[PDB]
A paper describes a structure:
The catalytically inactive DNMT3-like protein (DNMT3L) has an important regulatory role in this process by acting as cofactor of DNMT3A or DNMT3B6–8. In addition to CpG methylation, DNMT3A and DNMT3B introduce non-CpG methylation (mainly CpA) in oocytes, embryonic stem (ES) cells, and neural cells.
The structures of the DNMT3B–DNMT3L–CGA DNA (DNMT3B–CGA) and DNMT3B–DNMT3L–CGT DNA (DNMT3B–CGT) bound to the cofactor product S-Adenosyl-L-homocysteine (SAH) were both solved at 3.0 Å resolution. The two structures are very similar, with a root-mean-square deviation (RMSD) of 0.27 Å over 828 Cα atoms. The interaction between DNMT3B and DNA involves a loop from the catalytic core (catalytic loop: residues 648–672), a loop from the TRD (TRD loop: residues 772–791), and a segment in the homodimeric interface of DNMT3B, known as the RD interface in DNMT3A42 (RD: residues 822–828). Each Zebularine (Z5/Z20′) is flipped into the active site of one DNMT3B subunit, where it is anchored through a covalent linkage with the catalytic cysteine C651 and hydrogen-bonding interactions with other catalytic residues. The orphan guanine (G5′/G20) that originally paired with Z5/Z20′ is stabilized by a hydrogen bond between the backbone carbonyl group of V657 and the Gua-N2 atom, while the ZpG guanine (G6/G19′) is recognized by a hydrogen bond between the side chain of N779 and the Gua-O6 atom, as well as a water-mediated hydrogen bond between the side chain of T775 and the Gua-N7 atom. Aside from the CpG recognition, N779 forms a hydrogen bond with the T7′-O4 atom, suggestive of a role in recognizing the nucleotides at the +1 flank position. Furthermore, residues on the catalytic loop (N652 and S655), the TRD loop (Q772, T773, T776, K782, and K785) and the RD interface (R823 and G824) interact with the DNA backbone on both strands through hydrogen-bonding or electrostatic interactions. The N779A mutation led to reduced activity toward CGA, but not CGT, consistent with its role in contacting the +1 T on the non-target strand in the CGA complex.
Residue numbers in the entry:
A (entry chain C): 179 to 310, 320 to 348, 361 to 379
B (entry chain B): 179 to 310, 320 to 351, 360 to 379
C (entry chain D), D (entry chain A): 563 to 853
The structure:
Amino acid sequence: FETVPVWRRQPVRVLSLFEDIKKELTSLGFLESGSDPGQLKHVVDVTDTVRKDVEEWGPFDLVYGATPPLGHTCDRPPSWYLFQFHRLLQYARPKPGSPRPFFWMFVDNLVLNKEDLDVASRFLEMEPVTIPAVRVWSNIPAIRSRHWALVSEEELSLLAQTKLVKNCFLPLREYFKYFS
Amino acid sequence: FETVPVWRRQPVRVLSLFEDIKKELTSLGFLESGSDPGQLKHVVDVTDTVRKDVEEWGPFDLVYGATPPLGHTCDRPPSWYLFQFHRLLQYARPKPGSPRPFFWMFVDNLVLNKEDLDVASRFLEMEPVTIPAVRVWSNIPAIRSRHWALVSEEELSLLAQNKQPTKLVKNCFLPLREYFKYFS
Amino acid sequence: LYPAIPAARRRPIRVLSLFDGIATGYLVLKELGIKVGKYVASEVCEESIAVGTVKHEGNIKYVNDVRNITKKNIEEWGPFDLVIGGSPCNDLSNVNPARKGLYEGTGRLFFEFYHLLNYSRPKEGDDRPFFWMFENVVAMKVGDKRDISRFLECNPVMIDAIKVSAAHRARYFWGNLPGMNRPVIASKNDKLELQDCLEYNRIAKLKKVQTITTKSNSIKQGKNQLFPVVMNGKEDVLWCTELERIFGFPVHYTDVSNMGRGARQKLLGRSWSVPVIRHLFAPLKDYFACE
Amino acid sequence: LYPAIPAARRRPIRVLSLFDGIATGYLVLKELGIKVGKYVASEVCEESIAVGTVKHEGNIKYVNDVRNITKKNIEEWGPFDLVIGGSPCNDLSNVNPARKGLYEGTGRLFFEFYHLLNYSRPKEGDDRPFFWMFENVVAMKVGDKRDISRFLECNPVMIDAIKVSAAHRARYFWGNLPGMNRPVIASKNDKLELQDCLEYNRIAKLKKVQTITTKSNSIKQGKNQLFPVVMNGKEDVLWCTELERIFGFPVHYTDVSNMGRGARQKLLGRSWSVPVIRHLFAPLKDYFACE
DNA sequence: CATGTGATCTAATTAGATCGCATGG
DNA sequence: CATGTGATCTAATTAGATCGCATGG
Ligand SMILES: Nc1ncnc2c1ncn2[C@@H]1O[C@H](CSCC[C@H](N)C(=O)O)[C@@H](O)[C@H]1O
Ligand SMILES: Nc1ncnc2c1ncn2[C@@H]1O[C@H](CSCC[C@H](N)C(=O)O)[C@@H](O)[C@H]1O
Ligand SMILES: [Mg+2]
Ligand SMILES: [Mg+2]
C-alpha cells in the first residue's frame, strides 16, 4: 500500500455495514456534502444480499463493519455481524491485479465474548487492536502501527460493562481526496 | 430276567463297595459259611482301582453301592460315592450276550440332597424307591416291582436331621433268592 | 460446466475432508477406483480417527481441530482438488429441541468449512478442476438453510438414502459436483430392504427403518417404539454389523478401539449413507486417475 | 490303533460337541477341509450360541443343556464319529481361590462328558472308527487330574498354545486321537508373536502375552500390570479383533449380538487355541471325507 | 399425525482393581 | 517368585426411556 500523490487522490467509495458512518466520515471530509450521486452505500440488513449486488454497487475502496453499541437492539446473535461482514468482504474485493488501494475495517463495541473474538481474529487473519474503547480489525496500516494507550482489560471487564475511532478513520486521507 | 430253576442256581458273586454287607448276605443266606475263597469282594476307597482290577476279581453277579449312613466322618463329598459307583459298575458288566443274571443296586441313607439326587437318577437311568429310611436305585425287578408304603417327604425332610440300614434293605436283598443258591 | 480431461492428463486426486468422521469420503473414493494422492482429514474424535487410520492403514493425514487450520496450512497441504465436509448438526437438526442454530453452539463450525473452502479455492487465472461438497440435515430452520446457501453461494439438492439403502435419511448436499440433481438410481450391490442387512437366522419386520441417529431410540421403529428384528421368535434390536450394512459401510468397519454397541452407533448415526456419497462422487472418476 | 480307511470308503464326520462354547471344534474341522455331516452342540450361553449359528449359518444343531441329554437322544442324534468337549474350569482352575473341585459346583459337569461318552461309544463288536477328546486346565488339583484320568481311562497330554500362538495357554488333552503325544510344530500361517496379531499403527511391548482369562486383568502383563500395547505413544490394552488373532479365530468372529469388549473377552477366555485344536484334529482327514 | 446426523437424568451394568496361593523355576 | 479357561465389591459408565415440535402427509 504505497502512498499516492495528492493530485491523483480520487475520492473514497465506501461500504458501511450495520452502522452508518456517513456523518462521521463527512466531518473528516472524505465525501462531498453535496451528495448528488452517493459516495457511500449503507445496508442495515445483509441477509438477502448477493455478490451480484455488491459488484453492481460500484467498486469499493473501503468496507466498514461494526457491531451494535450496547444498545440491546439486537434481534441477532453477535457472531452474525462478523460472519456476514466476512461474506460481503470477499464479494467487494477486486481482482488480484490491484488497480488501486483497498482497505477494510471491522470494529466491535464490546459485544463479542472471548469465544467470538478468537473466531473474529481468525477469520480476519489478524489480532485486534483496542483504541481507548472499541476493538478494531483492519488492514489500514496506521491503525496497526500507531501504538494507542495499552492498558489491560482485566479492569475494564466490569468497568466498561466515537472520536477515538474517528481518529483511526483519519489515516485514509493519505490515500483519497480531502474535502473542506 | 427269566427265572432260573433251583437245581442250577449258582451262588452269588458279590462286589460290595463303601459299605460291607457280608454279614447281611450271610444272614439272609446268599453266602456259604465255610467260605474259604470268598464270593464277596469289599473295597472302601476305589480311587485307585482300574478296569483290570475289577476284571481280575472275577465275573460278578451283584454290584452293591451305599453311602455312609448319617455320619459326619466323611472325607468324600456326597456325590463322590455315586460317580465312583457308576464308574466301577461299567467295569463289572459282562459281554453283551448276558449268560446269567446281572444285578446292581445303590443305596443312599438320606445323604444325597436334591441336586445330587437328580444326578444319581440320570446316571443310573432310574428314579429311586424309598424304603422306610433309605433310597434305593436297583435293576432288581421285585425292588422296582413291589410297592412299599408311600411316604410324605415333606415330613421326612426334617426327619433327616434327627439322626444328628440292615433290616430295611434286607427286604431288598430278599428277591435275589429266586436267582441264586439258598444256603442255611 | 467444467471441460473434460484426457485419460492421460488425469492425476491422482487431492482431498481436504473437514469433519471427516469415519473416513466415509476416503472409503467411497477408493471404492470407485480413484487414485487418492492425498487425503487430509480434520477430526477430533479419537474413535473416529482410530477407524480411519486402522481401516485405511495410514493413508489419511489427520490434522486435528479445524479451527486450528491456518491459511498457510491450506497452501502447505495443498493444492486440493476436492473439499468435502459435513459439520455437526446437533445444534441444527430438529430432533434436538434445544438447538442453538448455526450462529451459536456447534453450528458455527459450518463457517469453518466456508472459511477453509475459500482458502482452498484456486486463485483467479487457474482453470484447473476443483470440486467441493457440503452435507447437513434437512430438519434445520429455514433461516439456517438460507444463510448456509448464501455463504456457499449455492442451493442444496436433497438426496434421501431411502432410494439406495434400507433407511430413511434425507440430507441436503451443497456442492458443485457434476450431476448432483440427476435422478438417484439404485445399484445391484445396494441392499435396499432391511432383510438384506440382517444376519443369519434373523427376520426383519419392516422393509425400511427410521432415520438412524446416535441414540438407541431411533432403532425402535414407529410411535409405539417397536423392535425392528425377530430372531429365535424373540424381538431384538439391530446389531452393529447390521447398522453398518444399512449405512452401506463394509461389515465390521467400526470394530475398532474395543467400541461397544453404543459407541459404534454414535459414529454411524452421524455418518453419511455410503451409496448416496457414491452417487455423488461417481462423476469424479472422469477427472482423476484410474486404479 | 485305528486301521486306515481307503479314501473312497470315507464318509462325512458326525460330531457331538459338549460345552461347545463358540463352536471352536466345528470351525477347526471346516478349515481342515473335513466334510462335516452332523455337528450336535450342547451349549447354554445365548451369546455363544449366537456366534455359532451366525458364523456357521445354521449348520450346527443346538441341544441346549447337557444335563438334559438322554440315552435316547444319543441314539437318535447318533451315530457320532467324534465326541469333543471342554468342561467349565471355574471350579477346577487354580486361578479361583474359592474353587469347589471336581465333585461340587461346576466341576461335576465333567461327568456329563463321561456319561454321554459311554452312551456314544460303539457297542461291543463295532470296529468302526471312533474318536473323542476332552480338554481342561493344567492348574488343577492333583486329585481332580487323577480322577478325571480314571473316569476316562486315559492320561492327558499337555499342549501349550505358546508354541503355535502368541499367548501362554497350558491345557490338558485327554483323548484317543491319532498322534496326540507327537511334537507340536508351528505352521506357515500361525501368528507366533503379539505384533503379528495387532492392528495397524500399534506396537507390541512383549513378544508373547500371559494366559488370557475372561477377566480384563489378564490383559495387563506381569506382576506390575503393564498395558501390552503402545499406540500413538500411549499405553493401551488389546482390542477384541487382536484377542481373536491371538487365539487363532478369524477376525470379527465374536462381533455378534451387540457384544462389547467385556462379553467378547469372556467368550474367548474360555475358548480353545485354534492352532492347538487344528494340531489335534489334523490326523482326522485320513478317516473322513474332504471338501 | 408421525417424524428426527439429540440432550437429559436416572437405572442397570459394566470396568477395574484387589484377592488368592501351590508350584516349578 | 512370578503365575492363573475366576469371583468379588465398588466406581465409572453406559442403556433406555422420556422429552420435544415444525411440518408435510
Ligand atoms: N472442532 C472440530 N474440528 C474438527 N472436527 C470436528 C470438530 N467438532 C466436531 N468434529 C467432528 O465432525 C464430525 C461431524 S459428524 C460427520 C461425520 C462424517 N461426515 C462421516 O461421514 O462420518 C464428527 O465426527 C465430529 O467428531
Ligand atoms: N449345563 C451346561 N450344559 C451345556 N453347556 C454348559 C453347561 N454349563 C456351562 N456350559 C458351557 O460350557 C462351556 C465351557 S467353556 C468351554 C468353551 C468351548 N470349549 C470353546 O471352545 O469356546 C461354556 O461356554 C458354558 O456356557
Ligand atoms: Mg447444487
Ligand atoms: Mg491321551
